[PDB]
């Protein structure tokens, strides 16, 4: 069995690579190398196909879409800033590739596709609540407003072709390989980047700010369930654990595993920022099996101890 | 004089604007490809009209397109659902693109003010056999649904990003001179006029017992010149619906009664899709437009039947 993974040489895409290939899977990786990197790969690894290319591109989704029993696809711009840069361009990939990739599953008869969607289609709705599925979409950018039109033609597909989607909306993704380069890089790659060379960060506003962080091999289970589970639901499933962590709190944990005084600059609050986000995880309980996640300091310290 | 760039301007709601436009001494620029629009829905002649004939999703076209222009109505879009159903790739160049090269345009050329021809297909099922408030949860069913919706939040976003002053309408079921019955997925009135102004059947799909908020094109045409002219247009969507309530049946009769001949009705069966109430939330539109008197039903498919 062969698993087409879009962005598979990204951060969330090559965790989930490892995992397909340890439980033997033929594993397809869809990758514009924008800011995926081969090194994220187990490259010589004798079940693992590496296609350079534009995921929005009709000919190329042919070919990489032949030979597959499912798909995961993660491919997008993940930068929402880049998004607000250049609608146009951002626009290809975060919509064009999902609706291309519908018509390429649907050409080749293939159902099974598992959509990262993003806590980012709420916009500011649900600020301070636990955020349910139905909350009211506010998408405030391009890359939310096409992770929402995304779903709903997955939903099109789904309906009118048969196709069979399995649509997740991520909050907040950390662990190794996140790339911490960017302003608006992660909040944990950054502080942790700092934080392991000794450097001082900026926390911008007083740290009160809560998100629900998710370690990344946590979400790639989510993942494999997704591909190998029976009948998956036809509507959207909220990842996340219903985590509430301060950024003081994240910084006292980080202080705490590299063992010296993190150095805190004070910036201002962040214009639009979000002071409380929260999954409501009600769905991802009930529709995957979770176990028992990671909690922040073990997935911290896994990070940490990778750079 | 001021010049309104019209996209989608030969088509069925573009060229009533267009007449009002050029009769209240605005200058007119007419944005079309001809899919669906007519030249001859033009009054090719008055001196204040311009056309230009291409695609709303090109991007040097619309630079060009722009230049001079003080306004905007966005009106260009395969209006049918079912041929977004059979192409959804090409029909979203025509029903999203379109609306975010425009809004690069705008923004590029300073033009704040658009004026958006959203859809009731942004809601889908829900709220079905209620009057649809604007905050209705979507739902929207077919890529030319969806595509509407995304159009509506691309155009938030410059309105935030980059100043723009969008007026974003969401229209029921608008019908009148010059909506073409050509299809099968025609607006039932062009379709059911058209059939009895030859003296022949009409099919009707279902009971009979559904429910549009229809609305006369010459009221949609006045809200959208004040959607034009309004000082400080709100930023969230309205709907142009009235709020009223035909039944297909009430149709058949006030229709057969106007033409003043015999109608004979042959049944098919209900469309898989078919909703079965529509109604609009008209308070938001009384709030922030001049509704005036609006044409009744019976007014408006005497207008319609009159011009054949
Ligand atoms: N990390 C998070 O917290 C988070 C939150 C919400 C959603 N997501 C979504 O999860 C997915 C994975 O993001 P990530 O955090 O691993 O970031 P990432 O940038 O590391 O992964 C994105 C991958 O997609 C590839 N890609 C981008 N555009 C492409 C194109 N046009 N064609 C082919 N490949 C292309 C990139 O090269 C990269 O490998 C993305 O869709 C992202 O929007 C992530
Ligand atoms: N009941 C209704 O009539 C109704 C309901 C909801 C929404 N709308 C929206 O109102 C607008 C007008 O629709 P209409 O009822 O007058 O139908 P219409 O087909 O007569 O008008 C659509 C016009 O847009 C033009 N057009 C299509 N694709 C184009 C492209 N790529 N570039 C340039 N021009 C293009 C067509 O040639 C036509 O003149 C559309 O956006 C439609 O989706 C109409
Ligand atoms: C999705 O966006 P989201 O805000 O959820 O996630 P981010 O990781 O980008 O930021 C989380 C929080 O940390 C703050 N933050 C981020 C980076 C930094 O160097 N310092 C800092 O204080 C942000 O302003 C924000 O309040
Ligand atoms: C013209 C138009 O925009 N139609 C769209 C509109 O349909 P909508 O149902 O709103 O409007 P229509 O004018 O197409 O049809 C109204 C009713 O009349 C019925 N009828 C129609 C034709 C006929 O010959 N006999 C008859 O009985 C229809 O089944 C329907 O029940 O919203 C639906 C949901 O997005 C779309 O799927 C339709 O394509």
Not at 75 to 99: C, G, K, R, Y
Not at 135 to 152: G, M, N, R, V
Not at 219 to 232: M, R, T
Request: charge should be negative.
């Amino acid at each position: 069995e062969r698993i087409l993974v879009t962005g598979g040489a990204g951060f969330i895409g090559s965790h989930l690579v490892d995992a397909l290939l340890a439980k033997g899977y033929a594993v397809r990786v869809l990758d514009d190398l924008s800011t995926g990197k081969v090194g994220n790969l187990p490259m010589g690894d004798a079940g693992l196909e590496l296609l350079v290319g534009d995921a929005a591109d009709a000919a190329l989704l042919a070919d990489a879409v032949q030979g597959c029993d499912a798909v995961v696809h993660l491919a997008a711009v993940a930068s929402v800033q880049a998004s607000v840069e250049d609608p146009v361009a951002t626009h290809q990939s975060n919509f064009i590739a999902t609706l291309r990739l519908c018509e390429a599953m649907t050409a080749a008869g293939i159902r099974r596709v598992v959509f990262a969607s993003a806590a980012a289609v709420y916009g500011n709705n649900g600020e301070g609540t636990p955020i349910a599925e139905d909350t009211p979409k506010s998408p405030l950018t391009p890359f939310a407003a096409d992770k929402l039109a995304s779903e709903y033609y997955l939903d099109f597909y789904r309906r009118q072709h048969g196709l069979e989607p399995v649509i997740l909306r991520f909050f907040n993704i950390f662990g190794p390989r996140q790339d911490p380069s960017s302003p608006y890089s992660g909040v944990i790659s950054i502080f942790s980047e700092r934080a392991k060379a000794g450097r001082p960060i900026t926390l911008f506003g007083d740290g009160g700010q809560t998100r629900d962080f998710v370690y990344v091999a946590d979400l790639v289970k989510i993942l494999v369930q997704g591909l190998e589970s029976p009948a998956p639901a036809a509507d959207a499933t909220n990842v996340g654990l219903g985590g509430v962590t301060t950024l003081n709190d994240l910084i006292g944990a980080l202080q705490q595993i590299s063992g010296k005084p993190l150095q805190v600059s004070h910036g201002a609050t962040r214009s639009g920022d979000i002071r409380h986000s929260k999954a409501d995880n009600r769905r991802l309980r009930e529709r995957f099996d979770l176990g028992t996640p990671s909690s922040l300091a073990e997935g911290l310290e896994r990070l940490y101890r990778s750079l």
